[PDB]
Amino acid sequence: ESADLRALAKHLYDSYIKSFPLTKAKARAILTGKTTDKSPFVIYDMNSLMMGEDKIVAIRIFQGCQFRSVEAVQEITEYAKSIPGFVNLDLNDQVTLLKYGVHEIIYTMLASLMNKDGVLISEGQGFMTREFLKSLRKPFGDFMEPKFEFAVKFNALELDDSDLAIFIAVIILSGDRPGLLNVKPIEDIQDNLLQALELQLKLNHPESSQLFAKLLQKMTDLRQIVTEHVQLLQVIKKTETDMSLHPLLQEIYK
Amino acid sequence: ESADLRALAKHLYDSYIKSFPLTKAKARAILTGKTTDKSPFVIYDMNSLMMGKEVAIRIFQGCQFRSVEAVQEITEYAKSIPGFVNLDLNDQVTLLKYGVHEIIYTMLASLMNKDGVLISEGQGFMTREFLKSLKPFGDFMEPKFEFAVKFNALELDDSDLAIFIAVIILSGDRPGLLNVKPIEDIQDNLLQALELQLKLNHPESSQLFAKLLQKMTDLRQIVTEHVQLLQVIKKTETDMSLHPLLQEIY
Ligand SMILES: CC1(C)CC[C@]2(C(=O)O)[C@H](O)C[C@]3(C)C(=CC[C@@H]4[C@@]5(C)CC[C@H](O)[C@@](C)(CO)[C@@H]5CC[C@]43C)[C@@H]2C1
């Protein structure tokens, strides 16, 4: 029944709101001209960066990004438990689903905080220029550019948070993940999520032909962001042996 | 209108049949569904191979020969896809150039099971195990088998694969495209036709459309990882003025 799919949509949307403090809706309200009830401070060069510390180098911008990632992971983890059936899966598979799904999700949601020109930071208080990031030294000025390229095409799908809630759930419950003990219960859950997403996209974007297929295709764009990111980390780990990574993040990488 | 989608679906199936000699229906018959009338010669070891200038290289090289054949058959097929020839010529070239690898692994799944791949005409069969028994070359075919095993579990037939292949060609995110709009316009139409096809041809296979699209992510990095050992091979085969005309064809 349609009815059951809508109810799952609603449930997932409700949990999404509860798990993620900075929604796409809030982020698009900050980025635009809109509703300057609170506009961001902007980082476009290094001494506006010094001014930034005051009302809100290549290393700490990275270490800072590392922080928002580990906190993002803990948030995605909270959301996953809300996915029906998820906590009932074998514990090893829960861990495995989180290991591989977490970065694909981080870059899906990061797009919400991005436009062509830059990215919101510190829960929206801040905004860091794409150009400033691209100008960073040696192995760091490279990190954010492919995320920006993805975000610009992903953002043109014009998804809202209730669409994203279901898409994110679909991503966590893959089944094609390396080392899954128990693939069939995982796929039963995903088929359910896919039915739900499909209905949601059709109802929320009736004029948008084949948005479902176009959104699913976007998943290969995510895969290769992760891939580039991972190998880039391996470089930095060698050029700066004094710089430390976060164990939680480290455990995620294999 | 469901009529035009169905019309499009039949068109591609017909075109697919004329462009590709060895169909999936045919290859399945020959394979382990055993059609036992003319058994294919089997290659399981070095001496059955010989019974078929350096073994491991020359297998990988024979692998290039048929892919070059495949490219031309795919090229012909693409030209039958409604709207394709009306596209900008550079865009047509671009679409084939970036799509042809994904199509090749896709169709190659049709010639594969968990134990090996139909070789040549289908008059041959090379065991998976003889293939992993190799140099740097032992890891060439294994990721294709792994993909094929999952892909084949979807139990698509030729009528399904016909539209799927068309969707792959008309992507729209290929680098260097000049006019993305008519390409996506066509792929949208192809995606609708594929959806209808799967619902009629597999009415009890839930969310098969989505799962098939999910496979495209598997194809792309299969391709991406393949180009990465495609050319550890230039770390291997290097200097000799014997193939420069042959070097050219590939
Ligand atoms: C044994 C040898 C030398 C001649 C016969 C045979 C065969 O299987 O029919 C053909 O040349 C086909 C390919 C190339 C062959 C083996 C695997 C390749 C292979 C699967 C090798 C991997 C390549 O990436 C692709 C997929 C082409 O991209 C090709 C497609 C064509 C076939 C099936 C065979 C090579």
Numbering used by the authors:
A (entry chain A): 207 to 262, 277 to 474
B (entry chain B): 207 to 258, 275 to 356, 358 to 473
Please, what does the article write about this entry?
In the present paper a series of previously purified and characterized saponins and sapogenins from Medicago species were tested for their ability to bind and activate PPARγ by SPR experiments and transactivation assay, respectively.
The MTT assay test and the transcriptional activity test performed on the most affine compounds (saponins 3, 6, 7, 8, 17, echinocystic acid 18 and caulophyllogenin 19) indicated that 17 and 19 did not show any cytotoxic activity at concentrations up to 100 μM concentration, but only caulophyllogenin 19 showed a partial agonist activity towards PPARγ. The final omit map showed clear electron density in the LBD of PPARγ where one molecule of 19 can be easily fitted. The 16α-hydroxy group is H-bound to the CO of G284 on helix 3 (2.7 Å). Moreover, there were extensive vdW interactions between the sulphur atom of C285, on the helix 3, and the carbon atoms of the rings C and E of the ligand. The position of 19 in the LBD of PPARγ was very similar to that of the partial agonist R enantiomer of LT175 (pdb 3D6D26) and also to that of the fatty acid 13-(S)-HODE (pdb 2VST27), a natural agonist of PPARγ. The X-ray structure of the complex PPARγ/19 showed an accommodation of the ligand in the LBD between helix3 and the β-sheet, typical of known partial agonists, where it formed H-bonds with the first strand of the β-sheet and with helix3. In fact, the X-ray structure of the complex PPARγ/19 showed that there could be additional space for the accommodation of the glycoside moieties in the region tipically occupied by full agonists, towards the helix 12.
